[PDB]
A paper describes a structure:
Insulin is a small protein hormone composed of chain A (21 residues) and chain B (30 residues), and it exerts its biological effects by binding to the ~340 kDa tyrosine-kinase type insulin receptor (IR). Insulin plays a central role in mammalian biology, and has a widespread impact on blood glucose levels, lipid and protein metabolism, cell growth/differentiation, and life span2. The evidence for the structural impact of the crosslinking in the analogues reported here comes from three crystal (analogues 2, 10, 11) and two NMR (analogues 8, 12) structures.
Analogues 8–10 indicated possible superiority of the i + 3 over i + 2 cyclization. This was examined in the next analogue, 11, in which the azido precursor at B27 was clicked with propargyl at B30. The side chain-free GlyB29 was used here instead of the wild-type LysB29 to avoid possible steric interference in the cyclization reaction. The full insulin IR-A affinity (103%) was regained in this analogue. The full IR-A affinity (103%) was restored in analogue 11 by expansion of the crosslink from position B29 to the B30 site. The LysB29→Gly mutation removed also possible side-chain interference at this site. In contrast to analogue 10, the crosslinked-loop is not in the plane of the B-chain; instead, it bulges sideways to accommodate the longer linker. Moreover, simple modeling of the B24–B30 segment of 11 on the insulin in the IR-A complex leads to an even more optimum conformation of the B27–B30 crosslinked-loop of this analogue in relation to the L1-domain and the αCT-segment of the receptor. In this model (not shown), the C-terminal part of the B-chain in 11 passes under the αCT-segment and folds back to embrace that segment on the other side of the αCT helix.
Residue numbers in the entry:
A (entry chain G), B (entry chain A), C (entry chain E), D (entry chain K), E (entry chain I), F (entry chain C): 1 to 21
G (entry chain F), H (entry chain H), J (entry chain J), K (entry chain L), L (entry chain D): 1 to 30
I (entry chain B): 1 to 27
Write the structure that this text describes.
Amino acid sequence: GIVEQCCTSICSLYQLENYCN
Amino acid sequence: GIVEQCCTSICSLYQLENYCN
Amino acid sequence: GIVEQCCTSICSLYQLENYCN
Amino acid sequence: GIVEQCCTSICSLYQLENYCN
Amino acid sequence: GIVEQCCTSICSLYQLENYCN
Amino acid sequence: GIVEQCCTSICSLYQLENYCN
Amino acid sequence: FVNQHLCGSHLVEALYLVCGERGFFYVPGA
Amino acid sequence: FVNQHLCGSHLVEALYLVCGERGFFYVPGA
Amino acid sequence: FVNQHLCGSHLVEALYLVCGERGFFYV
Amino acid sequence: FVNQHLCGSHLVEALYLVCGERGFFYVPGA
Amino acid sequence: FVNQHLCGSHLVEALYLVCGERGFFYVPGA
Amino acid sequence: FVNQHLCGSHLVEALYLVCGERGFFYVPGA
Ligand SMILES: [Cl-]
Ligand SMILES: [Cl-]
Ligand SMILES: [Zn+2]
Ligand SMILES: [Zn+2]
C-alpha cells in the first residue's frame, strides 16, 4: 500500500492523490 | 504574497505552485 | 464529525480514539 | 532514557505517558 | 509562562532559549 | 548545500543561518 | 482565515499517533 | 530505528494536503 | 496571537511538498 | 477554537530545536 | 545521519499530545 | 527509503524559525 510505495521512494502528488477517497 | 493569499482562504496545489522557483 | 467536535474544543485521547477505524 | 527506548523501537501511548511530568 | 509570552506575540530564538534547561 | 551539511550531522542555529536570505 | 485547515493538519497527526496500526478515516465536515 | 513510523507521519500530512475535502483512509501496512 | 506565523509554517511545508525539485523562495 | 493548543505544538518544536541537548520542561499554562 | 534528531522532533510532538495539561520533561541524554 | 526527503522537511521548518523576517531560499542539490 502507500507505505511500501511512498516510504521506499518519493511519491509525486499525483501518486499520492490515488490514495484519496 | 502567499500569506495574504493563502492564509485568508485555502489555496489549491496549483495556486501554491505560483510560489515555486 | 471530528472537525465539528475537535476543532471547536480540544479532544481527549479517548475522544480521538473514536475516529480510529 | 526516552530516546534509547523510543527511537530504537516504537513506543506505545502507555509508554509515552512515562515521560510525562 | 511560555504560552502567554510566545503565543500572544512572536518570540525570538533568544527569548525561547530562556525556557531551556 | 544544506542537505549534505545538515542531514549528515546536526547543524547549529548559527550554521543554519548561512542559508537565510 | 484558514483556522479549520490548520486544525485539521494537527488532527491527522494526532489520529496517526493515537490510532497506530489500527488506522483511521479522515474527511472534513462528516 | 523507527524510520518507517516517522515516514508515515509525513505521509499523513501529505495526504491531508493533497486530498483536501475528499478525505482519505490511512492505515500502516495496508 | 501569532496565527500568521503559524499559517506560514504550514505554507513552507506545503511548498516543500508541492515544489519538489524546483524548490521555493520564502520571505 | 483550539488555536492556543495548536500554537503550543509549534512552540514545543521550536524549543526542541533551540534547546538541543540541554532539553527542556514544557507544560501548558505554567 | 541525523536519525536521532529526526526521531526526537516527532517524540516531543507525541509527548505534547499524550501529556496534555500534565506536561513533560524532554532531555536526549537521559 | 526517503530519509533525505524527510530531513529536508525538518530543515525547511528550522529555516522558517531561524531566518525570521529574512526568509530563505530552498532548492535541493545546490
Ligand atoms: Cl496552527
Ligand atoms: Cl523524519
Ligand atoms: Zn520527520
Ligand atoms: Zn499548526
